[PDB]
């Protein structure tokens, strides 16, 4: 069963799909295909809890009803600046306008 | 004023069963071809009452006029008998057409088995339960529409 995710770092957000049985390690390989940075250089987080490679998406929390196509689950990503890994920093999206009078 | 609408196959006894309530006197041969409204002035469980029982009759006609007529039926008695079984096979069609005209699945209603020797259909008491409706095992020869009048009140 697929989980639909948004892997996010700074102002880079990736829309990909993965199997609930996929390992977190395997997820880092998919990012390596796109951002060309190795798994040893990636740290994946769910909210701010860090994920372990051998755990599977399911076990981390990503599940069919939490990771739906139309409402995917956010997976945080932090890259490795040489010896130490940067802090997870995901920059948010822009806020929307005040709901117009006619609509409320 | 409470409008009731009795309904069935030709031969069930709607035309007769009305006579026992309105006239308390059986008509063994009645013309199965004409429908009239029998207004009544009867106390029911202590209330002001004026029934408007329709004795349905005629050939089926799926028309605008006739649908809106039976849609005014505040409640129906779907009469079937035990001599015949074709009767018990038309009973579903009538029930369902009442839901179409009344725009709802839930309509005050009552299955009724009549003429209780042949016994083609044993007491389907079970069917009525799925219909979610009562049963009076009526015998015009020897008659409760009050059975049905409850449902309508509950409504």
């Amino acid at each position: 069963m697929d989980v639909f995710l948004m892997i996010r770092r700074h102002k880079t957000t990736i829309f990909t799909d993965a199997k609930e049985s996929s390992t977190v390690f395997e997820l880092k390989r998919i990012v390596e295909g796109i951002l060309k940075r190795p798994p040893d250089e990636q740290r994946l987080y769910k909210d701010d809890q860090l994920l372990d490679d051998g755990k599977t998406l399911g076990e981390c929390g990503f599940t069919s009803q939490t990771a739906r196509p139309q409402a995917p689950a956010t997976v945080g990503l932090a890259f490795r600046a040489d010896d130490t890994f940067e802090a997870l920093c995901i920059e948010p999206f822009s806020s929307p306008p005040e709901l117009p009078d006619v609509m409320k | 004023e409470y409008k009731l609408v009795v309904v069935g196959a030709v031969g069930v006894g709607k035309s007769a069963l009305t006579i026992q309530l309105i006239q308390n006197h059986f008509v063994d041969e009645y013309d199965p071809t004409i429908e009239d409204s029998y207004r009544k002035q009867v106390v029911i469980d202590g209330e002001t009452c004026l029934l408007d029982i329709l004795d349905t009759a005629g050939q089926e006609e799926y028309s605008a006029m006739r649908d809106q007529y039976m849609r005014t039926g505040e409640g129906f008695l779907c009469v079937f008998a035990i001599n015949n079984t074709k009767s018990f096979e038309d009973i579903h069609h009538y029930r369902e057409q009442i839901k179409r005209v009344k725009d709802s699945e839930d309509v005050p209603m009552v299955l009724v088995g009549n003429k209780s020797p042949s016994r083609t259909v044993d007491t389907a008491q079970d069917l009525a339960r799925s219909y979610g409706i009562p049963f009076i095992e009526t015998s015009a020869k020897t008659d409760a529409f009050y059975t049905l009048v409850r449902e309508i009140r509950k409504h």
Binding site: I14, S94, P96, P97 | -
Partner: protein, 86 residues
């Protein structure tokens, strides 16, 4: 395989190419990376979610779920969907 749609406000969204071809305006503009200048991140993120929904549920046999759109973003997504022919 993958393309980068970039919001007005700098956000970069890497969605599959097949998914972004759900958009007519993107289908032509890719004839790679695109830059939309009147679409804020929160509208394009939402648009990229629709790409995923249409591709997964198009030609399904059983129940599809509703595409949720909040009241706050409704007006902006309509215009963006008009501009992007999807």
């Amino acid at each position: 395989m993958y393309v980068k749609l970039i919001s007005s406000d700098g956000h970069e969204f890497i969605v599959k190419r097949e998914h972004a071809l759900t958009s007519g305006t993107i289908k032509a503009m890719l004839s790679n990376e695109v830059n939309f200048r009147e679409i804020p991140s929160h509208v394009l993120s939402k648009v990229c979610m629709y790409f995923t929904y249409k591709v997964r549920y198009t030609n399904s046999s059983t129940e599809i779920p509703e595409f949720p759109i909040a009241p706050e973003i409704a007006l902006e997504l309509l215009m963006a969907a008009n501009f992007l022919d999807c």
